[PDB]
Amino acid sequence: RDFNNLTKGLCTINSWHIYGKDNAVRIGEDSDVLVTREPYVSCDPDECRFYALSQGTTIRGKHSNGTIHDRSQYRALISWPLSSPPTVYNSRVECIGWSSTSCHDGKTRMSICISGPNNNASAVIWYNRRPVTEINTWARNILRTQESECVCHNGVCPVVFTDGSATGPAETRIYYFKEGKILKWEPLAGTAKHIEECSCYGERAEITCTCRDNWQGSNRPVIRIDPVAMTHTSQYICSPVLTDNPRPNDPTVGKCNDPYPGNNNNGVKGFSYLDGVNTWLGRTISIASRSGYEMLKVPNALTDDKSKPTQGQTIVLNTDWSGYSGSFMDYWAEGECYRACFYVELIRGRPKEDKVWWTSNSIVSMCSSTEFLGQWDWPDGAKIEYFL
Amino acid sequence: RDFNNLTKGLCTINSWHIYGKDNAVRIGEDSDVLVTREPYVSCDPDECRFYALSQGTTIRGKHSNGTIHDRSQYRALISWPLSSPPTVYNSRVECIGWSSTSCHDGKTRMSICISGPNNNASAVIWYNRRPVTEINTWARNILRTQESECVCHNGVCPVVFTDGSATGPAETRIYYFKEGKILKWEPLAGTAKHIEECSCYGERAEITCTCRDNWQGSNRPVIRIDPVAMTHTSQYICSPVLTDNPRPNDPTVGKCNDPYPGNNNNGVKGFSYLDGVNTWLGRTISIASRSGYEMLKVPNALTDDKSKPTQGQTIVLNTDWSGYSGSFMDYWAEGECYRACFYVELIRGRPKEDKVWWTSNSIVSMCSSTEFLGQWDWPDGAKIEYFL
Amino acid sequence: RDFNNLTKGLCTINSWHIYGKDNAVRIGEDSDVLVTREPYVSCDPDECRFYALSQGTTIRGKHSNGTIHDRSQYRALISWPLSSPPTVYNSRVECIGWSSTSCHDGKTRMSICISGPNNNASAVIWYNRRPVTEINTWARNILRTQESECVCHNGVCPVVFTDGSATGPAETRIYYFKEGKILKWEPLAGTAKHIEECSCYGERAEITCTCRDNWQGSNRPVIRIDPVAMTHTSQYICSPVLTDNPRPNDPTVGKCNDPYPGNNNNGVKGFSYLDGVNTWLGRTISIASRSGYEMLKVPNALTDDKSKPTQGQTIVLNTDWSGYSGSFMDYWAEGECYRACFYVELIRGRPKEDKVWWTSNSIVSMCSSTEFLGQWDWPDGAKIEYFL
Amino acid sequence: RDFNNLTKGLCTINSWHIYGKDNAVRIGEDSDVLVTREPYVSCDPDECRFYALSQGTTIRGKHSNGTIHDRSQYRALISWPLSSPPTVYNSRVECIGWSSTSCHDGKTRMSICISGPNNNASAVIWYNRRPVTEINTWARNILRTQESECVCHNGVCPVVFTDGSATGPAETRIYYFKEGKILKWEPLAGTAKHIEECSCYGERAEITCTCRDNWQGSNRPVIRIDPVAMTHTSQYICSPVLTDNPRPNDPTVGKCNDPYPGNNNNGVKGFSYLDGVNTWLGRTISIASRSGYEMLKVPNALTDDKSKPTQGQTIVLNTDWSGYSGSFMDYWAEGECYRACFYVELIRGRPKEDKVWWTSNSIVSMCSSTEFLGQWDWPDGAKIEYFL
Ligand SMILES: *[C@@H]1O[C@H](CO)[C@@H](O[C@@H]2O[C@H](CO)[C@@H](O[C@@H]3O[C@H](CO[C@H]4O[C@H](CO)[C@@H](O)[C@H](O)[C@@H]4O)[C@@H](O)[C@H](O[C@H]4O[C@H](CO)[C@@H](O)[C@H](O)[C@@H]4O[C@H]4O[C@H](CO)[C@@H](O)[C@H](O)[C@@H]4O[C@H]4O[C@H](CO)[C@@H](O)[C@H](O)[C@@H]4O)[C@@H]3O)[C@H](O)[C@H]2NC(C)=O)[C@H](O)[C@H]1NC(C)=O
Ligand SMILES: *[C@@H]1O[C@H](CO)[C@@H](O[C@@H]2O[C@H](CO)[C@@H](O[C@@H]3O[C@H](CO[C@H]4O[C@H](CO)[C@@H](O)[C@H](O)[C@@H]4O)[C@@H](O)[C@H](O[C@H]4O[C@H](CO)[C@@H](O)[C@H](O)[C@@H]4O[C@H]4O[C@H](CO)[C@@H](O)[C@H](O)[C@@H]4O[C@H]4O[C@H](CO)[C@@H](O)[C@H](O)[C@@H]4O)[C@@H]3O)[C@H](O)[C@H]2NC(C)=O)[C@H](O)[C@H]1NC(C)=O
Ligand SMILES: *[C@@H]1O[C@H](CO)[C@@H](O[C@@H]2O[C@H](CO)[C@@H](O[C@@H]3O[C@H](CO[C@H]4O[C@H](CO)[C@@H](O)[C@H](O)[C@@H]4O)[C@@H](O)[C@H](O[C@H]4O[C@H](CO)[C@@H](O)[C@H](O)[C@@H]4O[C@H]4O[C@H](CO)[C@@H](O)[C@H](O)[C@@H]4O[C@H]4O[C@H](CO)[C@@H](O)[C@H](O)[C@@H]4O)[C@@H]3O)[C@H](O)[C@H]2NC(C)=O)[C@H](O)[C@H]1NC(C)=O
Ligand SMILES: *[C@@H]1O[C@H](CO)[C@@H](O[C@@H]2O[C@H](CO)[C@@H](O[C@@H]3O[C@H](CO[C@H]4O[C@H](CO)[C@@H](O)[C@H](O)[C@@H]4O)[C@@H](O)[C@H](O[C@H]4O[C@H](CO)[C@@H](O)[C@H](O)[C@@H]4O[C@H]4O[C@H](CO)[C@@H](O)[C@H](O)[C@@H]4O[C@H]4O[C@H](CO)[C@@H](O)[C@H](O)[C@@H]4O)[C@@H]3O)[C@H](O)[C@H]2NC(C)=O)[C@H](O)[C@H]1NC(C)=O
Ligand SMILES: CC(=O)N[C@H]1[C@H]([C@H](O)[C@H](O)CN)OC(C(=O)O)=C[C@@H]1N
Ligand SMILES: CC(=O)N[C@H]1[C@H]([C@H](O)[C@H](O)CN)OC(C(=O)O)=C[C@@H]1N
Ligand SMILES: CC(=O)N[C@H]1[C@H]([C@H](O)[C@H](O)CN)OC(C(=O)O)=C[C@@H]1N
Ligand SMILES: CC(=O)N[C@H]1[C@H]([C@H](O)[C@H](O)CN)OC(C(=O)O)=C[C@@H]1N
Ligand SMILES: *[C@@H]1O[C@H](CO)[C@@H](O)[C@H](O)[C@H]1NC(C)=O
Ligand SMILES: *[C@@H]1O[C@H](CO)[C@@H](O)[C@H](O)[C@H]1NC(C)=O
Ligand SMILES: *[C@@H]1O[C@H](CO)[C@@H](O)[C@H](O)[C@H]1NC(C)=O
Ligand SMILES: *[C@@H]1O[C@H](CO)[C@@H](O)[C@H](O)[C@H]1NC(C)=O
Ligand SMILES: *[C@@H]1O[C@H](CO)[C@@H](O)[C@H](O)[C@H]1NC(C)=O
Ligand SMILES: [Ca+2]
Ligand SMILES: [Ca+2]
Ligand SMILES: [Ca+2]
Ligand SMILES: [Ca+2]
Ligand SMILES: [Ca+2]
């Protein structure tokens, strides 16, 4: 119809309610479920769907052997109905590649997939299910993007890309697309020192992205974008409640404009909702591995270097496997505010469970409630022994 | 379009004709059919579908082991095309949880799923396929609801919930929703002493629910709701033709305002159509187990404590397994009256058939005819031996 | 939109071209294909689909054992996309039962399914996918109907039913439905002595049905219906080219008003297009079994007792299994005439191939061409050995 | 809506970007994927889909044995969603046969399938999913057509057919269809000596087809059609960069009006985009077998007998199997030019991999970019060993 505008603010988050869960690995033990990873959720004006990068094989298939690998010619961004598992028969391919993002601008959807060898990758930007623009690697070192939805405002949909080292300075760019065409791009600015896999959301004409500093930071870098002026800033979440993984133990004071030290060259895609006292941070419970997942209300986390939790909610027990997490919202819902949502990737198989030769995941997703709801934990639920 | 109003009365029920049957267990012996239980049927203005609580695994899958359990994080309310089986590929998830209800108000559908641990469950009310309202447990003891469709009148859709003991007084509430929002709720009133799993239908601006008194009654409690005044009353079916299970043998006089004694702390979801002489009661044939199913015309059953059958129809032989049963009607059909319909859950597996490690069911459904049709019996049809 | 009227005459049939083929048994050897029998084809104004009576199990499933049986509670009329096989995941249930017919009147579709025990069967007439009318058995001996599509004219859709003996006089009725309601019914009249499984088509406001005289005739009875006056006549195809099966060898002169003798109490559903010199008869090649299938142009077959073939086309070799056959046409196609079409059921399994415990079929369908096209044979194509 | 007119010219091809890939053989190792061959891609105004000739069996099915054979009664033209694999459950049958073409004219789609024995084949032309016209074999020797999409201009859709010898002069005809009806046909004219499997595209009211001279040429014949005058010309690509397979090594000067000698009675379906300096040729890397695939920019290839490459892009490594290739474009995309696209059939199984008894393929497809994108290779990806 008309382009969507981020006219609302976030609803007050007093707890999180279950939104979707596909139990993909449980079901796929005996049905034609595709092996995936790097999942996310994204809404169209009339439907919300699950998204992920297929590995081009079913979990029970012999080709599932080796799916711990990230980039192959057999991967593709697929989407499927909310809470259903990604099956061979219900998965819709959005584009071919091993790194992606996708978002609806109110009129139609833009999907981006990057493919190619490490030194010669390229992004293809699809709009209205047709390829429109292509961007060649600029640093010749794994051109890569968000792995979760982008956000649009009056037709302008910013996307964060990184090309270059994962263990030193890299070349991050913010591209501003409209109808799949490049309006402008700019190099990363601000104090964030390394950027990977940004998780974004929008409210009141501003887009906030919480990313991953793979090089040095255990606190997460934050990029705030003005989609009208097509400009941005960057910094780190100030709070001493560290949210990357692996990470050192939480200190009493964090860092606002530099990576909090202790862990180098590693991390995990994550997210946050930074809205004054209505601020909630997601993180794995373990400081060593992708185990467990919790949401912590940390008032003013972005700007207060001593901010600590005032409330929380466990999503996945520390005795269960988690993984990537990111933000999304249904910008086309009723009401006066945008309801914050997120998903957690529940990785099964390698490297943590190496009795099987594959790596896959299932999805759990939650949205905020203004009520203070009781909590439950949401594990993947599959028994690896069954796959032996 | 416009909200549906219960403007018609029930058609005269002279017999029951076959409406739908999915043969799910037979088919699922060699196809990707999801394990389910607590099924029902519900219509939209342009389509009627089967509904149930999936267990998040196929019947042949190794994860089917243990599906006798009621509440897990792997359950979800799913719907699928009438008379097709609930497969991985055709089942649409309405919401996540282990207790549910759903109904269309003429404009769109409201679905409710409750999830969480026993002492911290919560209901999430979805409208137009989006989460709108959440309600936290008030008694911290398995918040639970109907397990069959709710009914709407001019946008108001009442739903009966119970939180608390299953073997003593509990806290039952009647919530009046409109567009997924709470207009009002009220505590159960009247003489019904315990309420669980209400089966409802509407006619001439009144909604009648036949429920399960798990604590003490072998006769069934009845809640009648005025969706305009948003008020209700409750009592028990007076008739000595007892319809819960297990239950004592039928006496010559029943009880109108108290549970008929003889069996405690157990029961089965059931239903009835209470319309003067046009009154029909459903029940298992066995007084000891969920075996067989029959419909009995018992004129004035609700108000006459000595009422006995004047006609009947066998639905499932006593030599076949039955289970839950509930009411639904196609409020959008042509004609001058609403045609009464019902479904019977045909449970297979545990605990009655323990050679297999799973518990599931198939569905059979019938609607009324003004003709006096010949009768057939409708068993699940699967051979457990095939699953060994 | 508006009710369809049979305003066109038949196109000139100079040969038959391939229209559809599902290769169901071949494909189902390794996919979730439902066991079926009694198939047919029927068009809606915007789509033509395959129809059949499912047996409520896949072919590879253990429940396929015993599917030679005709009437069980696990059967249902299903439809699916043209030339695709009837799978668990793409088959749409139209109604429950073991005998059926279905047709579109231009506005919506009417489907009829009969179910029940031999002495207490009933038909349920569905219109716009909702049950509207029910008819109880009148002779208490396997109420049964066409097993191929009915035909409508200005909303009136006649259907032929038989109740009673299959080996002596029975009670055949012609019901005239409009919007699923009974306008009128009448007992069979004319000289046809026994009627079963009528195959019908319409042209120029007249509906012609070629049926099966199971009791005594090897020539086929013909019922011609006037859907406006709602009246009919009946006789037999006069031609000595006999078309039932089993049957005696072809004589030089046939019978116009009595069954041609030689074979009793058996037969097969079949069809014909009776249009003066543009007359074509279908039949099995074998006079003893459901083997092979050919189309023969027999000018004036209906009225000329000495009529013999002037042209022909082999459809299935005598070395391949055939079965039921019936007529259908796309009444919503472009052009000035209706193109005659037919399907042949290719039965596999029991009783002819008893190394397997099941009975099923695939479908082949053809339509007429005004060209004189080269011919090919169209067998089922599956290797029974693969199923052992 | 309105008939599409070829009003645009080709976009400048500076490189090729990944468009679609189904990984059919990898996925089908453990899912119900149909065996196919002779694939292509074709767009409708609102969707682009994959097309191919099914063999009427799954790859894992026992009936996959023998699928190296080209013409059987179990083949059909099927289409399915872009980049999904051709499964039993998502494949839509367009028509029955073993040779085909299909194209959308802007209003609806025309599909053509040829079937029958070698000496009595016939084509059936479908329009708006209904059979409209039939054409009988004129040379009684494998009537056959394009195996890739046709192209339309103002309702007129030319199609190239060949009937007769594959190793000597044959009878090629160009048929001009409109709404599935024959407007005109004409015998092949010009200097092309043998024509098979034309790959076509349109721009600025002209349709260009690059075909296969199976008899003598290793250079490819080219037919250029004027769809308004309904006339055509034919010649060969002049360039010494030979593009059929098998073929002799590249010479320094080619042949414009005669087959370049060296290899007889064999070839492979292929394609090219002939647009002055914006000319790109596709070909297998191997001169001996269907191994590898590359795109070569050969300015003025059509008219310059000494033209050599100025740029190139590898699509499939010479160490991987390729096969048929053809052209298609999305004539309904936005922008001022038509973006050239192509697909490559990746054949797996027999005859090159005879450890398995089947022959099938997967699909990879690319479209042009005005950027100079980095290149990757795109193999089928399946491990034959897994199928043993
Ligand atoms: C029914 O459901 C309801 C609703 O969910 C349940 O009630 C919920 O209960 C939760 C558990 O108690 C509770 O969550 C906690 O909230 C705390 C904040 O509230 C408290 O503090 C404020 C501040 O003054 C008070 O106002 C308030 O009244 C409370 O006292 C959080 O602090 C909790 O998080 C911390 O603990 C958990 C372990 O439980 C850690 O996993 C988490 O990371 C936090 O602790 C780590 O981090 C801090 C910050 O740096 C450190 O100080 C601390 O030492 C920990 O650090 C170690 O561990 C981390 C992670 O491994 C590691 O990185 C680091 O290096 C260190 O090793 C927690 O979020 C909900 O708020 C509450 N909700 C409501 C509405 O009441 C109810 O119980 C249920 N009922 C039943 C019967 O079950
Ligand atoms: C073709 O199809 C037609 C259509 O279906 C078939 O005709 C149908 O036939 C049915 C079977 O006969 C018949 O159903 C019965 O109707 C009885 C009512 O009709 C009779 O009574 C009235 C009243 O005066 C008369 O007007 C009428 O003419 C009849 O005489 C019911 O009473 C029957 O139900 C009772 O019997 C069955 C066993 O058959 C029980 O399962 C059922 O629960 C009822 O009996 C129990 O309950 C009562 C009430 O408390 C007790 O009094 C009784 O002792 C039983 O109690 C024990 O069992 C229960 C359950 O296990 C347990 O809880 C309790 O503790 C005790 O242990 C029955 O419904 C249809 O009405 C009739 N329909 C028509 C239109 O005619 C026809 O036969 C078919 N043709 C062929 C050739 O097959
Ligand atoms: C390329 O394709 C084209 C197009 O298909 C092929 O050409 C077609 O060729 C067909 C085969 O020759 C041909 O079909 C036959 O047509 C005959 C009619 O045409 C002839 O007669 C007329 C009449 O005077 C002439 O005008 C005309 O020129 C011809 O001479 C039919 O009579 C044929 O049917 C009979 O034979 C077949 C066996 O082939 C039987 O199966 C069939 O049932 C018919 O015979 C039985 O029935 C009659 C009637 O009672 C009896 O008289 C006879 O004895 C048989 O009875 C026994 O068998 C039956 C069945 O088992 C049993 O019930 C009974 O009791 C007895 O035991 C046949 O239909 C097409 O018309 C022709 N089409 C065209 C357009 O030309 C061409 O060949 C192909 N090219 C190549 C190179 O292959
Ligand atoms: C990141 O990605 C980019 C983008 O893809 C990569 O850059 C690309 O690199 C490609 C490989 O170098 C390059 O492709 C080649 O282009 C050549 C044309 O460019 C050159 O010549 C012109 C002309 O003067 C110059 O202007 C230009 O600057 C270059 O020097 C082609 O000639 C190449 O094709 C030939 O070689 C390949 C083998 O590599 C053959 O497979 C191919 O068939 C061509 O050679 C055969 O055919 C010719 C013509 O007859 C014969 O002369 C020759 O002897 C060969 O013949 C034998 O082999 C054939 C086939 O088997 C057989 O039939 C025959 O009988 C003989 O046996 C090739 O296409 C891209 O243009 C370039 N793109 C860009 C934008 O730069 C970059 O490398 C990547 N980066 C990294 C770090 O990897
Ligand atoms: C493009 C790509 O390969 N992305 C991969 C990403 C990067 O390796 C990381 O961001 C360091 N640069 O890591 C992970 C991961 O689970 O940690 C998964 C992604 N598939
Ligand atoms: C929420 C929940 O668990 N409901 C379960 C219900 C209750 O246990 C019963 O109503 C006693 N309170 O029992 C049964 C049952 O087959 O009997 C199935 C339901 N899954
Ligand atoms: C209602 C029913 O059972 N119809 C069956 C029909 C009758 O038995 C026959 O018409 C004799 N009355 O026979 C056959 C058959 O293959 O011959 C199949 C049908 N399923
Ligand atoms: C109609 C038909 O059979 N076409 C086949 C075609 C012809 O044999 C060739 O064009 C020589 N005439 O060859 C091939 C092939 O892979 O080479 C596949 C096609 N299925
Ligand atoms: C978003 O804002 C622009 C005004 O700049 C307007 O064009 C558009 O209609 C707005 N979108 C909606 C849904 O109102
Ligand atoms: C139901 O009743 C209300 C009048 O209160 C009206 O708004 C609505 O239109 C009615 N619904 C229909 C379908 O007529
Ligand atoms: C069929 O005929 C009746 C006239 O009796 C008319 O109502 C109807 O419109 C006709 N149908 C069509 C499609 O014209
Ligand atoms: C194509 O051209 C013809 C004019 O001959 C016109 O009828 C038609 O509208 C044109 N198509 C479009 C999409 O404009
Ligand atoms: C495939 O077919 C050939 C030819 O009939 C036969 O020899 C071979 O054994 C078959 N292989 C399988 C696996 O069926
Ligand atoms: Ca880090
Ligand atoms: Ca009870
Ligand atoms: Ca399987
Ligand atoms: Ca007979
Ligand atoms: Ca050649």
Coordinates of C-alpha atoms in Angstrom, one line a residue, chain A residues 269-379:
Chain A
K269 CA 25.1 -12.6 17.1
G270 CA 23.0 -10.9 19.8
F271 CA 20.6 -8.1 20.4
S272 CA 19.0 -5.6 22.8
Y273 CA 16.2 -3.1 23.2
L274 CA 17.6 0.3 24.4
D275 CA 14.8 2.5 25.5
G276 CA 15.7 4.3 28.8
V277 CA 14.4 2.4 31.8
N278 CA 12.5 0.2 29.4
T279 CA 15.9 -1.4 28.4
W280 CA 16.3 -5.2 28.1
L281 CA 19.4 -7.1 27.2
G282 CA 19.6 -10.7 25.9
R283 CA 22.6 -13.0 26.5
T284 CA 23.7 -16.6 26.9
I285 CA 23.9 -17.6 30.6
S286 CA 27.3 -19.2 30.1
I287 CA 30.3 -16.9 29.7
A288 CA 32.1 -19.7 28.0
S289 CA 29.7 -21.2 25.5
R290 CA 26.5 -20.9 23.6
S291 CA 24.6 -22.3 26.5
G292 CA 21.4 -21.0 28.0
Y293 CA 19.7 -17.7 27.3
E294 CA 18.2 -14.9 29.6
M295 CA 16.7 -11.5 29.2
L296 CA 17.8 -8.8 31.7
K297 CA 16.1 -5.5 32.3
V298 CA 19.0 -3.1 32.7
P299 CA 17.7 0.5 32.9
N300 CA 19.8 2.9 30.8
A301 CA 22.2 0.1 29.8
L302 CA 23.3 2.1 26.7
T303 CA 24.4 5.2 28.6
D304 CA 25.1 4.1 32.2
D305 CA 28.4 2.4 32.7
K306 CA 27.4 1.0 36.1
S307 CA 23.9 -0.2 35.2
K308 CA 22.9 -3.5 36.6
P309 CA 19.7 -5.7 36.4
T310 CA 16.4 -4.8 38.0
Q311 CA 14.4 -7.7 36.6
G312 CA 14.9 -10.7 34.4
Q313 CA 13.5 -13.7 32.6
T314 CA 15.2 -17.0 31.8
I315 CA 14.5 -18.2 28.3
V316 CA 16.7 -21.3 27.9
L317 CA 18.3 -23.1 30.8
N318 CA 22.1 -23.1 31.1
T319 CA 21.8 -26.9 30.7
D320 CA 20.5 -26.4 27.1
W321 CA 22.1 -25.2 24.0
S322 CA 21.3 -21.7 22.6
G323 CA 23.1 -19.8 19.8
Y324 CA 22.3 -16.7 17.7
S325 CA 19.6 -14.2 18.8
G326 CA 18.1 -11.2 17.1
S327 CA 15.4 -8.6 17.1
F328 CA 12.2 -8.2 15.0
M329 CA 8.8 -6.6 15.5
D330 CA 5.5 -6.7 13.8
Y331 CA 5.3 -3.1 12.5
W332 CA 1.9 -3.8 11.1
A333 CA 0.1 -4.8 14.4
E334 CA -2.7 -2.8 15.9
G335 CA -2.3 -0.6 19.0
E336 CA -0.3 2.5 19.8
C337 CA 3.1 1.0 20.3
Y338 CA 5.5 -1.5 18.7
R339 CA 5.8 -4.8 20.7
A340 CA 9.5 -5.8 21.0
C341 CA 10.2 -9.4 19.9
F342 CA 13.2 -11.6 19.6
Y343 CA 14.3 -15.2 18.5
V344 CA 16.9 -17.5 19.9
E345 CA 18.6 -20.0 17.6
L346 CA 18.9 -23.4 19.5
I347 CA 21.9 -25.1 17.9
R348 CA 22.1 -28.8 17.9
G349 CA 24.9 -31.1 16.7
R350 CA 28.4 -30.0 16.0
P351 CA 30.7 -28.8 17.5
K352 CA 29.1 -29.3 20.9
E353 CA 27.4 -32.6 20.1
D354 CA 29.8 -34.4 17.9
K355 CA 28.2 -37.9 18.0
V356 CA 26.3 -36.7 14.9
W357 CA 28.0 -35.3 11.8
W358 CA 25.7 -32.4 11.3
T359 CA 24.9 -29.0 12.7
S360 CA 21.4 -27.6 12.7
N361 CA 19.0 -25.7 14.9
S362 CA 15.4 -25.0 15.8
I363 CA 13.8 -21.7 16.7
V364 CA 12.1 -20.2 19.8
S365 CA 10.8 -16.7 19.7
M366 CA 9.1 -14.4 22.2
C367 CA 7.5 -10.9 22.3
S368 CA 7.0 -8.5 25.2
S369 CA 4.0 -8.3 27.5
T370 CA 2.9 -5.3 29.6
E371 CA 1.9 -8.0 32.2
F372 CA 4.5 -9.6 34.5
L373 CA 4.0 -13.2 33.3
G374 CA 5.3 -16.3 34.8
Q375 CA 8.3 -17.8 33.1
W376 CA 9.1 -21.2 31.5
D377 CA 12.3 -22.4 29.8
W378 CA 12.2 -23.4 26.1
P379 CA 14.8 -25.9 25.0

